[PDB]
Design a protein around this ligand. Structure first.
Ligand SMILES: Nc1ccn([C@@H]2O[C@H](COP(=O)(O)O)[C@@H](O)[C@H]2O)c(=O)n1
Ligand SMILES: Nc1ccn([C@@H]2O[C@H](COP(=O)(O)O)[C@@H](O)[C@H]2O)c(=O)n1
Ligand SMILES: Nc1ccn([C@@H]2O[C@H](COP(=O)(O)O)[C@@H](O)[C@H]2O)c(=O)n1
Ligand SMILES: [Mg+2]
Ligand SMILES: [Mg+2]
Ligand SMILES: [Mg+2]
Lengths: 164, 159, 158
């Protein structure tokens, strides 16, 4: 008796990748044509990485690197949707499911708007939730800072977890 | 008892003008803020935190800068609309917390005024609203006084 | 009932041979410039707690104009924040923080930070998350001009 119930947890992820050569970027599982790619060991999906770290952070499980180190061949080159699904499983094992997530793509270019709803659908599938539990938005910094100078893209993500 | 989290981040550049508007307060200043609306970075970030928590997108979806009807819009009115459509979806405000990231002007004399206006627009008590301000120690675009940034977070509760 | 808060703090590097983060002394080619001991991480956590509780920010409670707090241990400042948040009726549910720094390497120090933070917050270690990341040499953190921290907190009614 007298156990904890209906507990909730907050997490926040902030990720950055710099532009490099390529013909597209990948955000939220969606390939977006662009004259640069993002520099990364795999697909450079800044949005899914930030969401992953928000989930792990809420669960006090560290960050992606703690669970998928580069020394581990299993996850070498892994698709970031597959990584996110593995994060969801780890967090579930610890007793937590997703209540909702909200994320902000900080990018001067390309435009994110036409891709947002597709991202929401894929993220919701990977998180095991309804689309109404997932929000993605975007903003520029009005040509200020490293995102404004088109040097890279940043994402802020927050997550609220609920006890399973 | 269900709840939702949201986060908003907004930036506006300085431009010509004699005041800025933050949290509904007009602060005399050497520059204004450039924006389609009145440029209230703080109310924009709060609006996006609320829309984000309710999975309703962002303020640019609801009040596009391609629509001249929203030119110079009072961001308090935009925020009140956000509160209304969040309520329609079944949520009210639990609490909000925001950080103004600005090298200048000093926000301190205006914080409590901002809290009262924000609480009124959100339909909550002043104790459910926190506003704070910080500098970046003259680093980065806010430190060079190129613009102002705001981070806001919101927790929604079931109506 | 629960409450959300967020803190963001930045300090610039200055001449020195260590920094203090999460209560831990980390050797470095520079120090951090600050009125206090410069612990960006504890400052951001303090502001997330105060923000959630609608108690303002840490400068309201420990003004930089007061010489008595010059060089102050940011853990002691945090312990006071925890006490006044409790007096208002709130305790910590969990916190999550991100150190944004190109250097020094934070990884060897994180578990030590979590232990000190959890003690100061009056919670278990499994209620405290700290992670570190770079901006891939972009921006003022990428140019090694300073360190930033983002922290979020969820408070629970006492
Ligand atoms: N890279 C970006 C940046 C912003 N946007 C969208 O543009 C609108 C206005 O953004 P700004 O306020 O940054 O101009 C928002 O609705 C935002 O989601 C976008 O679709 N792609
Ligand atoms: N633009 C700003 C920036 C900070 N401040 C206040 O100054 C104090 C210290 O902030 P800094 O250490 O960032 O200078 C804080 O309490 C903050 O509320 C302000 O009143 N206006
Ligand atoms: N200042 C820093 C930045 C990152 N890190 C470590 O580097 C890992 C990967 O971070 P980046 O992707 O930012 O390089 C983190 O999970 C953390 O263990 C660190 O230990 N100190
Ligand atoms: Mg990444
Ligand atoms: Mg705006
Ligand atoms: Mg500080």
């Amino acid at each position: 008796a007298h156990h904890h119930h209906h507990h909730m947890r907050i997490g926040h992820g902030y990720d950055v990748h710099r532009f490099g050569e390529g013909d597209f970027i990948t955000l939220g599982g969606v390939r977006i044509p662009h004259k640069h790619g993002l520099v990364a060991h795999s697909d450079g999906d800044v949005l899914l990485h930030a969401l992953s770290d928000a989930l792990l952070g809420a669960a006090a499980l560290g960050d992606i690197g703690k669970h998928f180190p580069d020394t581990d061949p299993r996850f070498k080159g892994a698709d970031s949707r597959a990584l996110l699904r593995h994060v969801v499983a780890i967090v579930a094992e610890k007793g937590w499911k997703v209540g909702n997530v909200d994320a902000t793509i900080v990018a001067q270019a390309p435009k994110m708007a036409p891709h947002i709803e597709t991202m929401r659908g894929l993220i919701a599938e990977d998180l095991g939730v309804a689309v109404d539990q997932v929000n993605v938005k975007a903003t520029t910094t009005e040509r200020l800072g490293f995102t404004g100078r088109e040097e890279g893209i940043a994402v802020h993500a927050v997550a609220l977890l609920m006890a399973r």
